[PDB]
Amino acid sequence: ALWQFRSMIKCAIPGSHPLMDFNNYGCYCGLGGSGTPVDELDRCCETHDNCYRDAKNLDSCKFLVDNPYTESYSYSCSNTEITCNSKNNACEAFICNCDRNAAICFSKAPYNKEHKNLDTKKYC
Ligand SMILES: C[C@H](CCC(=O)NCCS(=O)(=O)O)[C@H]1CC[C@H]2[C@@H]3[C@H](O)C[C@@H]4C[C@H](O)CC[C@]4(C)[C@H]3C[C@H](O)[C@]12C
Ligand SMILES: [Ca+2]
Ligand SMILES: [Ca+2]
Ligand SMILES: [Ca+2]
Ligand SMILES: [Cl-]
Ligand SMILES: [Cl-]
Ligand SMILES: [Cl-]
């Protein structure tokens, strides 16, 4: 679920900015997206979006109001290391996996301030 994705990110990037949740980043970091990612970080988000899209296409899975972000799962954090619980059901494991990979991807990408709250309608 969305709130778990945020904690997962805190887990991988302890020095994250709490107020960052109020803003969007690049072309894909945020609800929806358009065009092509502007940088590595943005790519991580697009990929995560794509991962959720695949989640919505799983024949055996249908989420509340069709939003994968509502699906809560179980996971643990240890030394900035994320682990999805094997007890998660297939749908939850798929979502937990998308989040884990995205969080890891975020931790390795450069944060470019110029892309914060980008004028998407013009550069995306
Ligand atoms: C983890 C990312 C920032 C990394 C960073 O702050 N590096 C600097 C570290 S340091 O000071 O130099 O130590 C931030 C950039 C924009 C953020 C995204 C945007 O805020 C858009 C949404 C907001 C939602 O609440 C959570 C998912 C999300 C899709 C966020 C995931 C994550 O929190 C992102 C991808
Ligand atoms: Ca998005
Ligand atoms: Ca269902
Ligand atoms: Ca659940
Ligand atoms: Cl989002
Ligand atoms: Cl349902
Ligand atoms: Cl459900």
* 29 C-beta closer than 6 A to ligand 1: yes
Domain around 68:
1-124
Alpha carbon nearest to ligand 1 atom 12, residue: 15
* 13 C-beta closer than 6 A to ligand 1: yes
- Count up the domains in the chain and report the number: 1
Q: What is the CA radius of gyration of the chain?
A: 14
| Amino acid identity at 119 | D
Alpha carbon nearest to ligand 1 atom 2, residue: 106
Q: What is the CATH number of the domain that holds 7?
A: 1.20.90.10
Burial string for 56-87 (b: 16+ CB within 10 Å, else e) reads eeeeebebeeeebbebebebeeeeeebebeee
* 6 C-beta closer than 6 A to ligand 1: yes
Q: Of ligand 1's atoms, which has the minimum distance to the CA of residue 12?
A: 1
Among 91, 95, 120, CA closest to 8? 95
Q: Which residues contact 54 (CB under 8 A, 6 or more apart)?
A: 94
Among 28, 19, 25, CA closest to 112? 25
